[PDB]
Design an enzyme around this catalytic site. Structure first.
Site, PDB file in Angstrom:
ATOM      1  N   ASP B  61     -20.430 -52.516   2.971  1.00  0.00           N
ATOM      2  CA  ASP B  61     -19.060 -52.212   2.593  1.00  0.00           C
ATOM      3  C   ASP B  61     -18.278 -53.501   2.367  1.00  0.00           C
ATOM      4  O   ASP B  61     -18.491 -54.509   3.045  1.00  0.00           O
ATOM      5  CB  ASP B  61     -18.383 -51.370   3.676  1.00  0.00           C
ATOM      6  CG  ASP B  61     -17.262 -50.503   3.131  1.00  0.00           C
ATOM      7  OD1 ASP B  61     -16.781 -50.774   2.010  1.00  0.00           O
ATOM      8  OD2 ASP B  61     -16.860 -49.548   3.827  1.00  0.00           O
ATOM      9  N   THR B  94     -14.227 -50.594  -2.523  1.00  0.00           N
ATOM     10  CA  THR B  94     -14.156 -51.734  -1.813  1.00  0.00           C
ATOM     11  C   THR B  94     -14.817 -52.782  -2.389  1.00  0.00           C
ATOM     12  O   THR B  94     -14.244 -53.700  -2.615  1.00  0.00           O
ATOM     13  CB  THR B  94     -14.495 -51.442  -0.474  1.00  0.00           C
ATOM     14  OG1 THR B  94     -13.382 -50.836   0.026  1.00  0.00           O
ATOM     15  CG2 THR B  94     -14.573 -52.565   0.262  1.00  0.00           C
ATOM     16  N   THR B  95     -16.048 -52.683  -2.610  1.00  0.00           N
ATOM     17  CA  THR B  95     -16.789 -53.705  -3.339  1.00  0.00           C
ATOM     18  C   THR B  95     -16.404 -53.745  -4.810  1.00  0.00           C
ATOM     19  O   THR B  95     -16.557 -54.791  -5.450  1.00  0.00           O
ATOM     20  CB  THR B  95     -18.292 -53.465  -3.213  1.00  0.00           C
ATOM     21  OG1 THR B  95     -18.642 -52.254  -3.894  1.00  0.00           O
ATOM     22  CG2 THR B  95     -18.692 -53.346  -1.755  1.00  0.00           C
ATOM     23  N   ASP B 391     -16.860 -43.501   4.840  1.00  0.00           N
ATOM     24  CA  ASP B 391     -16.598 -43.567   3.407  1.00  0.00           C
ATOM     25  C   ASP B 391     -16.738 -42.202   2.748  1.00  0.00           C
ATOM     26  O   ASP B 391     -15.995 -41.890   1.814  1.00  0.00           O
ATOM     27  CB  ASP B 391     -17.536 -44.578   2.745  1.00  0.00           C
ATOM     28  CG  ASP B 391     -17.261 -46.004   3.185  1.00  0.00           C
ATOM     29  OD1 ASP B 391     -16.350 -46.208   4.015  1.00  0.00           O
ATOM     30  OD2 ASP B 391     -17.956 -46.920   2.699  1.00  0.00           O
TER      31      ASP B 391
HETATM   32  N1  LIG Z   1     -26.337 -41.537  -8.882  1.00  0.00           N
HETATM   33  C1  LIG Z   1     -25.719 -42.629  -9.392  1.00  0.00           C
HETATM   34  N2  LIG Z   1     -26.010 -43.081 -10.630  1.00  0.00           N
HETATM   35  C2  LIG Z   1     -25.409 -44.164 -11.156  1.00  0.00           C
HETATM   36  N3  LIG Z   1     -24.478 -44.877 -10.499  1.00  0.00           N
HETATM   37  C3  LIG Z   1     -24.088 -44.537  -9.247  1.00  0.00           C
HETATM   38  C4  LIG Z   1     -24.703 -43.369  -8.610  1.00  0.00           C
HETATM   39  N4  LIG Z   1     -24.144 -43.259  -7.392  1.00  0.00           N
HETATM   40  C5  LIG Z   1     -23.249 -44.271  -7.254  1.00  0.00           C
HETATM   41  N5  LIG Z   1     -23.218 -45.033  -8.365  1.00  0.00           N
HETATM   42  C6  LIG Z   1     -22.363 -46.226  -8.580  1.00  0.00           C
HETATM   43  O1  LIG Z   1     -22.361 -47.065  -7.421  1.00  0.00           O
HETATM   44  C7  LIG Z   1     -21.063 -47.631  -7.225  1.00  0.00           C
HETATM   45  C8  LIG Z   1     -20.745 -47.747  -5.738  1.00  0.00           C
HETATM   46  O2  LIG Z   1     -19.452 -48.314  -5.553  1.00  0.00           O
HETATM   47  P1  LIG Z   1     -18.897 -48.561  -4.064  1.00  0.00           P
HETATM   48  O3  LIG Z   1     -19.515 -49.832  -3.535  1.00  0.00           O
HETATM   49  O4  LIG Z   1     -19.046 -47.274  -3.293  1.00  0.00           O
HETATM   50  O5  LIG Z   1     -17.328 -48.820  -4.302  1.00  0.00           O
HETATM   51  P2  LIG Z   1     -16.339 -49.002  -3.046  1.00  0.00           P
HETATM   52  O6  LIG Z   1     -16.798 -50.290  -2.407  1.00  0.00           O
HETATM   53  O7  LIG Z   1     -14.960 -49.067  -3.664  1.00  0.00           O
HETATM   54  O8  LIG Z   1     -16.589 -47.773  -2.207  1.00  0.00           O
HETATM   55  C9  LIG Z   1     -20.080 -46.737  -7.967  1.00  0.00           C
HETATM   56  O9  LIG Z   1     -19.179 -47.522  -8.755  1.00  0.00           O
HETATM   57  C10 LIG Z   1     -20.921 -45.833  -8.847  1.00  0.00           C
HETATM   58  O10 LIG Z   1     -20.595 -46.011 -10.229  1.00  0.00           O
END
Ligand SMILES: Nc1ncnc2c1ncn2[C@@H]1O[C@H](COP(=O)(O)OP(=O)(O)O)[C@@H](O)[C@H]1O
Ligand SMILES: Nc1ncnc2c1ncn2[C@@H]1O[C@H](COP(=O)(O)OP(=O)(O)O)[C@@H](O)[C@H]1O
Ligand SMILES: Nc1ncnc2c1ncn2[C@@H]1O[C@H](COP(=O)(O)OP(=O)(O)O)[C@@H](O)[C@H]1O
Ligand SMILES: [Mg+2]
Lengths: 537, 526, 535
Positions: B61, B94-95, B391
């Site tokens: 995270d 977050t990331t 999350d």
């Molecule tokens: N099944 C999937 N296929 C393609 N991309 C995905 C899938 N699941 C998640 N993602 C991508 O992974 C990323 C995870 O972001 P994340 O680190 O959770 O953001 P934050 O840190 O704001 O929570 C998302 O932007 C999403 O587009």
């Protein structure tokens, strides 16, 4: 498990990001000394010596570097002096921006061999486009091409006056040393111009000595310091007492034969000085040494004798005055002949006043009519700057007279290559088109640096600059907008054909060839191993 | 060698000025963005940060990694605070907020080195951000058939993508079904303190469960707990805030006695005070006793003889969850005990999950709370599982009050680059080099979905810019197959306010870095 | 460059960045495997009945010779965060099941060693981790094929003894391989609640005293405490004990608050003497009116109350611990009484031979309870030749008490000796071709790592690993796969059903589940942010 080396190993994108910051550490220094709005720097040493300069070679040579990618850009500036001579701030900014845009490509998981092969397709096309889009050779403009190309080099330095005082002295210096060669080669050796420095009057009192200006003194204060219709005797052997060699010793068995050997060391010495002086020779130049016994024969006969001159200065005098550099006795087992028909000639050899020093001048030399420039400045810091700025100005007119081809300066070449290479990348571009497209953006940093140092508009003046060069390539209606540059005193695109902003062709051809080749070597440091210093074992 | 005064400037402070200050701030944000760069996408790895005390914390995270780096740079602290506010407002941004804000500075990094006074960049960043947050609201899909099975399926798809890029690979269908069922049992406040996440060492991820009631950790008891069996089919819970010890003293009482006949009457009265409190708990059906204050050896043996269970020294966070589970009320005074203040459950046992004992409550239908017991193989494994659970909870918490969702992956971030490049070609001036640079900066979210696993990310962006300019607007990056795919049809969903607060926090952070021209640091650090 | 900018400014991001360590590279995954393989190679020699023990020295200089994988990794000073997760992996197996703490570390190091060659081929580390989840799911479903037990806790204790002999066969209790195995079976069934399938280990007291031998370890149905008869002329043997358990000290009743009792005249001071003289006669008569002949007290005794015990023929012990008297009231069926006034005949405990036994030249005199009446609390008295053989037997028999607890939680068994690992390795190889799309190489690395545990038994038994494993695995494909493993003396044939090598199903079910999830948390990590020096 891992490598057992005693040094340090860093892989990945760590060194790929460190080499760009090593090249940007050098480019951000010399970015403030580019163009007519560029400003000089100060180079202070630990011992207290101060060097005020703005040339890209003098700064990076005295500056200490540690990074291996930093020594590539510092040695790149040293090669520009020997190959071209003024092209030695612009190569460092291009070669560092070639690595900055290629770093953005390798972060997109593009292989660097496609960027290396993409840069070679853009570098060879840039030389092809600049050799087919030149204006004219040195026949139409005549002497106006040599003066306007000289003022472009002086605009970034201390001698960039609004007049044509320093511009006319450089053109009259190169045109007076025209040395022909075999197979029709009119060579112009600019190293034969003796550039001297003296803290005296202002820069408008810089004398153009038609001849040679020897930096030495007469020695004995009993010789005539001005000889009209002089005959120069150039020779390289020490006029001292006859000392025997190591293999010869004086072992006397009779005390009556003692004083005749002691007088023989000066009689053989004065025998040479009487046969070189009875042939009408008045000026004698010697790279060896004339002792106090031999100085009497020039005061008695009324001749000038200059001792301990440089060997590089004697060759420039004997070739320009028709003298023969003689080292010893010669001509088929002759005792003392000296070949008196091979003496030099000079109109006047006069030692003038050079603000509390002695300087010997030779007027027109009667054989070749060479030239030497005596510079006049306020202090010793300006005289070292005036010498470097004059030597870079002599290299500009040398390449124009040799290679009769000039290109428009002030960012006019980099604006035309920024749009032709974008259309070149679209035709034959499948996977290396992104490297040719970033080659055009890296070339745009030369008109971008002219807008930063002038404190003008940056993203609008260069955008108006490439607006004229785009219409000169896509609208074939004879617009003649290939010579559109920058007016840094006004902040508007001007025509460099009528304004007189001219640069030689190989100041940009060799600049684009050296910066592209240097960007390939720094692009292949994906792995770097640094060992520990082996000093005290 | 220049500044040598008799009285110095302030004390010894160094301050940069102008254009070398701004590139120093942009390049500093690029280094701190590498700590969240490899944690994006389902093929993104985690990171392990060890402090000076030796405590290891492995997470992915952005709010967890950036708080453990101990960054002391002034401009790089701006990217840490937007990762903290994304966890405080959304919970799963977050990331992506930290990495997108670093690209807003790197796309203008060749522009700030050549002129371009930063008031034009701030005006162009605020213009592109307001158009970006408006096109999300005009394209976020919604339904008009809620309070059905279709609304629960919308909450499960947003929780599976929230559980993506975590330490969960095949447990997406098991854990995210429990996250949706956790927030639907809560009331209309959506308080995060009404759900207990307790870590029990030992067991796989399939051994975890969602308790409908509550469960506490069975803290330090006394002699008498090996009795009082844990078989109750319909018990009553007496939540108390009183001490059940013999030594309950008000710390100011001095019982001055005069004779030995009255001296024994005081000692008999001290037992009669404690035994009268135990008779109030008795004769009311309250077989289970819970109190946050400790219970001595006297009241422990009294409940063992009367076949009653007790539990002392319960934490106050667990008794608040226990009150909402059984539907009772915590009574400090035992004199007002009645049938309206006691709880009611069905199954109350003390199990042996993970070696340690846990008293769990189950069977109450009027349960306004829940408890999600985590079982893992390491203490850092369950802390990441707890951080991955928060999350998914905070995504489905915001999805109830706002059911407008968008496509996941790089589908929204690519089509916002389409609407901004078309807007930049319709306005004159220096904004064509800034609105278009803002659109090219949004394309790194499909880049990090591919750069973490290869995928030939240069060729996959030419397919994304061609599909969004021709057909649908929800085409993104497929993770299993190395091709483009419709993320709306592949059920890769995320709420619309996740990307709205991501674009708002990244733009206000990027406008703050370009607006500071001087950085003065005082040397007094004690 | 580091710690400097291109414009000459100092480039400081985090505090004390010069003394930091950061590795992303390609060796960050390589450093995790080489740190985990050295832990697995250490625990490989202590696997099976021919597994050699390890000598552990504490920080205080105490030496403990341990063989179980839980106590070996816990008593290390390893300051490595990858190997610290292997300590918590062996601790999680001990807290849940408690039998395969050694085998769960060799299995986790085997999955990482097979993933090292898969990493050089270009496979993503999460793609190996996603391939291990699809491969471990086949090992769970194949392990539930042959599983049956006939335990009724009445007379069919023969599957319960042979299950505990597999756990005790690898320890140092093989001299008492039949005696001590029957102790751990009867200790669980007398304290377990079969209606709830819950076993409480607080009712099983494990005590140890030096002296005697390993064959003198007996299962004492009752409690064993340190007897502290305040009178040296107390009778040391009670035939029929009516035990009066109380929690009040033999003293005049002192309140919990500040009193400062005032004495004014000499009639009040003479009332002080008659108050305490009648109080010691009241606390003694209230025990004798209930018919009790033995008293247990948590707190101390007065000197005046000591002689009143001998005059009334009432033996009593002094200063018993907290949970010690909690075990007396369950073993004797009595109730713990707070005061003396609440004593009655219904709150008394029943016990038979109550005596103290002196051990050699020492002065311990522990309690021995021979006879009881339906007790739900037992006490195992472990004896030995030194403290090294007793503290290990406390750890060895605790693993035997856990495998009987796992049979009440789940009455399904498997066959150990490497028989279940070879059979599960064939199930992943059969489903690797259905289908070999992407995770074909990840499933074959799982099956090659499941064969490390039976080939480690062949290495410790003096055999050859690749010679013995090829013979056993080929015999399970040519016919229907039996319980076919290996042994040390080999017992003739290699049939684990005839050699009675029985292990629990949920023991090996958690060995594959915990080692896969711990591999996933050490494969899905691409950076290390450890500091430099300590100060
Ligand atoms: N099944 C999937 N296929 C393609 N991309 C995905 C899938 N699941 C998640 N993602 C991508 O992974 C990323 C995870 O972001 P994340 O680190 O959770 O953001 P934050 O840190 O704001 O929570 C998302 O932007 C999403 O587009
Ligand atoms: N009058 C002018 N108008 C516009 N540009 C000029 C003018 N005079 C010089 N320049 C620019 O200034 C630059 C000076 O480059 P310089 O530092 O001399 O290169 P080098 O270091 O190789 O000698 C040239 O590239 C030229 O384009
Ligand atoms: N008689 C036997 N024949 C063959 N193998 C045996 C025999 N007894 C024990 N083993 C093997 O020895 C291994 C001992 O494992 P162990 O170290 O006790 O695991 P843990 O550390 O989890 O308790 C078991 O996996 C079992 O297969
Ligand atoms: Mg064992």
């Amino acid at each position: 498990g891992p490598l057992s080396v005693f040094g340090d190993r860093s892989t990945g994108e760590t060194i790929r990001s460190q080499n760009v910051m090593a090249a940007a550490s050098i480019a951000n220094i010399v970015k403030s000394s580019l163009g007519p709005v560029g400003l000089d720097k100060m180079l202070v040493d630990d011992i207290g010596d101060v060097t005020i300069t703005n040339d890209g070679a003098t700064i990076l040579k005295l500056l200490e570097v540690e990074h291996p990618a930093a020594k590539v850009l510092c040695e790149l500036a040293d090669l520009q002096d020997k190959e071209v001579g003024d092209g030695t701030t612009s190569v460092v900014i291009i070669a560092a921006e070639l690595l900055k845009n290629a770093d953005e490509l390798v972060k997109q998981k593009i292989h660097p061999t496609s960027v290396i092969s993409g840069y070679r397709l853009a570098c060879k096309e840039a030389v092809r486009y600049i050799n087919e889009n030149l204006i004219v050779n040195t026949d139409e403009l005549g002497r106006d091409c040599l003066i306007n190309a000289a003022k472009t080099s002086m605009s970034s330095k201390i001698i960039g006056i609004n007049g044509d005082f320093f511009a006319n002295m450089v053109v009259d210096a190169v045109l007076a040393i025209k040395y022909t060669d075999i197979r029709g080669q009119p060579r112009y050796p600019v190293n034969s111009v003796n550039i001297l420095k003296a803290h005296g009057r202002s820069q408008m009192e810089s004398m153009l000595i038609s001849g040679y200006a020897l930096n030495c003194v007469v020695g004995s204060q009993g010789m005539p310091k001005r000889i009209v219709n002089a005959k120069i005797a150039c020779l390289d052997f020490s006029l001292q007492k006859t000392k025997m060699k190591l293999g010869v010793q004086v072992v006397i068995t009779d005390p009556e034969k003692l004083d005749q050997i002691r007088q023989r060391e000066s009689d053989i010495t004065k025998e040479r000085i009487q046969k070189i002086l009875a042939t009408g020779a008045n000026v004698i130049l010697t790279t060896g040494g004339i002792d106090d016994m031999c100085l009497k024969y020039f005061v008695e006969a009324g001749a000038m004798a200059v001792r301990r001159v440089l060997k590089r200065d004697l060759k420039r005098i004997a070739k320009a005055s028709g003298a023969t550099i003689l080292s010893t006795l010669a001509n088929l087992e002759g005792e003392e002949t000296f070949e008196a028909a091979m003496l030099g000639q000079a109109e006047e050899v006069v030692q003038e006043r050079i603000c509390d020093d002695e300087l010997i001048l030779i007027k027109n030399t009667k054989a070749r009519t060479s030239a030497s420039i005596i510079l006049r400045g306020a202090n010793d810091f300006m005289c070292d700057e005036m010498e470097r700025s004059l030597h870079d100005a002599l290299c500009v007119v040398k390449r124009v007279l040799e290679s009769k081809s000039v290109v428009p300066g002030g960012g006019a070449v980099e604006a035309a290559l920024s749009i032709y290479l974008e259309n070149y990348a679209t035709s034959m571009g499948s996977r290396e088109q992104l490297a040719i497209a970033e080659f055009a953006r890296s070339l745009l940093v030369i008109p971008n640096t002219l807008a930063v140092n002038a404190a003008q508009d940056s993203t609008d003046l260069v955008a108006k600059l490439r607006a004229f060069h785009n219409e000169a390539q896509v609208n074939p209606e004879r617009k003649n907008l290939k010579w559109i540059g920058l007016d840094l005193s006004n902040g508007k695109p001007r025509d460099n054909k009528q304004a007189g902003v001219f640069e030689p062709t190989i100041v940009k051809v060799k600049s684009l060839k050296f910066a592209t080749e240097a960007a390939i070597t720094i692009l292949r440091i994906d792995d770097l191993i640094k060992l520990h210093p082996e000093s005290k074992d | 060698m220049m500044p040598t005064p008799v009285i110095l400037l302030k004390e010894g402070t160094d301050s940069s000025q102008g254009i070398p200050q701004l590139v120093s701030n942009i390049s500093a944000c690029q280094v701190i963005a590498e700590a969240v760069r490899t944690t994006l996408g389902p093929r993104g790895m985690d990171k392990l940060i060890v402090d000076g005390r030796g405590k290891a914390t492995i997470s992915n995270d952005g709010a967890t990694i950036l708080k453990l780096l101990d960054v002391v740079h002034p401009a790089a602290k701006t990217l840490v605070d937007i990762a903290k506010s994304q966890d405080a407002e959304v919970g799963d941004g977050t990331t992506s907020v930290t990495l997108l804000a670093a690209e807003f500075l790197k796309q203008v990094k060749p522009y700030v080195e050549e002129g371009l006074h930063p008031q034009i960049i701030i005006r162009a960043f605020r213009t592109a951000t307001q158009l970006a947050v408006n096109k999300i609201k005009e394209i976020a899909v919604t339904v008009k058939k809620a309070d059905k099975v279709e609304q629960r399926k919308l909450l499960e798809k947003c929780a599976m993508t929230a559980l993506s890029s975590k330490l969960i690979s095949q447990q997406k269908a098991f854990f995210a079904k429990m996250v949706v069922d956790a927030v639907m049992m809560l009331d209309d406040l959506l308080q995060l303190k009404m759900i207990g996440i307790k870590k029990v060492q030992g067991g796989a991820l399939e051994d975890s469960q969602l308790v409908a009631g509550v469960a506490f950790k069975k803290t330090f008891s006394y002699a008498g707990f090996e009795m009082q069996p844990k078989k109750y089919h319909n018990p009553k819970i007496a939540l108390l805030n009183v001490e059940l010890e013999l030594k309950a003293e008000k710390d100011n009482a001095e019982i001055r006695v005069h004779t030995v006949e009255d001296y024994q009457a005081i000692v008999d009265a001290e037992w009669n005070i404690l035994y009268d409190k135990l008779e109030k708990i008795h004769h009311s059906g309250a077989k289970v006793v819970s109190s946050k204050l400790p219970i001595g050896d006297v009241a422990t043996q009294y409940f063992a003889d009367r076949d009653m269970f007790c539990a002392g020294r319960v934490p106050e966070e667990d008794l608040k969850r226990t009150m909402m589970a059984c539907g009772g009320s915590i009574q400090t005074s035992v004199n007002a005990l009645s049938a309206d203040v006691l709880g009611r459950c069905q199954v109350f046992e003390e199990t042996q999950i993970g070696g340690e004992r846990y008293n769990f409550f189950t069977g109450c239908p009027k349960a306004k709370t829940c408890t999600f017991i985590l079982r893992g193989g390491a203490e850092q494994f369950m802390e990441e599982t707890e951080r991955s659970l928060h999350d998914a909870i905070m995504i489905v918490r915001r999805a109830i009050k706002n059911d407008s969702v968008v496509a996941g992956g790089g589908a929204i971030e690519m089509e916002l680059s389409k609407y901004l490049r078309d807007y930049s070609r319709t306005i004159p001036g220096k904004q064509q080099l800034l609105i278009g640079a803002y659109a090219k900066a949004l394309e790194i979210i499909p880049r990090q979905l591919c750069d973490n696993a290869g995928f030939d990310a240069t060729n996959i962006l030419n397919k994304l810019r061609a599909r969004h300019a021709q057909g649908g607007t929800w085409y993104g990056v497929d993770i299993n197959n190395e091709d483009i795919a419709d993320n709306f049809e592949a059920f890769v969903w995320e709420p619309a306010m996740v990307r709205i607060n991501a674009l708002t926090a990244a733009s206000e952070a990027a406008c703050l870095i370009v607006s500071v021209d001087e950085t003065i640091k005082n040397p007094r650090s004690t | 460059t580091l710690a400097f900018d291109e414009y000459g400014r100092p480039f400081l991001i985090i505090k004390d960045q010069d003394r930091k360590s950061r590795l992303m590279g390609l060796e960050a995954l390589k450093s995790h495997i080489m740190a985990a393989k050295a832990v697995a190679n250490t625990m490989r020699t202590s696997l099976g009945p021919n597994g050699l023990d390890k000598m552990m020295v504490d920080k205080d200089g105490d030496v403990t010779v341990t063989n179980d994988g839980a106590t070996i990794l816990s008593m290390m000073d390893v300051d490595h965060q990858i190997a610290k997760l292997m300590v918590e992996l062996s601790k999680s197996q001990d807290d849940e099941i408690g039998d395969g703490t050694t085998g769960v570390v060799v299995l986790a190091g085997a999955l990482l060693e097979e993933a090292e060659q898969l990493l050089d081929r270009g496979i993503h580390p999460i793609r190996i981790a996603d391939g291990y989840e699809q491969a471990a799911r086949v090992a769970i479903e194949h392990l539930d094929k042959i599983s049956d037990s006939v335990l009724v806790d009445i007379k069919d204790t023969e599957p319960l003894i042979q299950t505990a002999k597999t756990t005790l066969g690898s320890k140092v209790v093989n001299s008492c391989h039949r005696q001590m195995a029957e102790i751990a079976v009867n200790a669980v069934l007398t304290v377990a609640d079969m209606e709830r399938r819950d076993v409480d280990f607080e009712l099983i007291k494990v005590e140890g005293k030096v002296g005697g031998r390993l064959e003198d370890t007996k299962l004492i149905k009752g409690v064993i405490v340190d007897k502290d008869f305040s009178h040296p002329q107390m009778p040391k043997k009670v035939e029929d004990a009516k035990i009066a358990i109380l929690t009040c000290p033999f003293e005049p009743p002192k309140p919990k608050t500040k009193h400062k009792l005032d004495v004014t005249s000499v009639e009040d001071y003479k009332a002080l003497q008659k108050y305490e003289k009648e109080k010691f006669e009241e606390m003694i008569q209230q025990i004798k009116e209930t018919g009790a002949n033995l008293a247990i007290c948590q707190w101390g005794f007065d000197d005046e109350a000591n002689h009143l015990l001998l005059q009334n023929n009432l033996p009593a012990v002094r200063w018993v611990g907290g949970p010690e008297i909690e075990l007396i009231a369950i073993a004797t069926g009595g109730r713990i009484v707070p005061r003396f006034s609440e004593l009655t005949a219904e709150k008394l405990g029943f016990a038979g031979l109550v005596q103290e036994i002196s051990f050699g030249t020492t002065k311990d005199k522990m309690l021995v309870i021979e006879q009881c009446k339906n007790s739900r609390a037992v006490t195992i008295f472990i004896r030995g030749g030194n403290k090294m053989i007793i503290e290990e037997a406390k750890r060895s028999l605790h693993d035997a008490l856990c495998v009987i607890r796992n049979l009440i939680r789940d009455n399904r068994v498997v066959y150990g000796g490497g028989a279940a690992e070879i059979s599960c390795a064939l199930a992943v190889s059969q489903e690797a071709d259905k289908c070999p799309t992407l995770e074909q190489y990840a499933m074959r690395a799982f099956a090659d790592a499941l064969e490390v545990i039976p080939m480690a038994l062949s290495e410790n038994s003096g055999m050859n690993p690749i010679q013995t494993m090829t013979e056993v695995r080929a015999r399970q494909v040519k016919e229907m796969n039996p319980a076919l493993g290996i042994d040390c003396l080999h017992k003739g044939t290699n049939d684990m059903k005839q050699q009675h090598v029985i292990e629990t199903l949920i023991g090996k079910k958690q060995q594959i589940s915990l080692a896969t999830q711990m591999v996933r948390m050490i494969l899905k990590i691409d950076d290390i942010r450890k500091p430099g020096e300590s100060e």
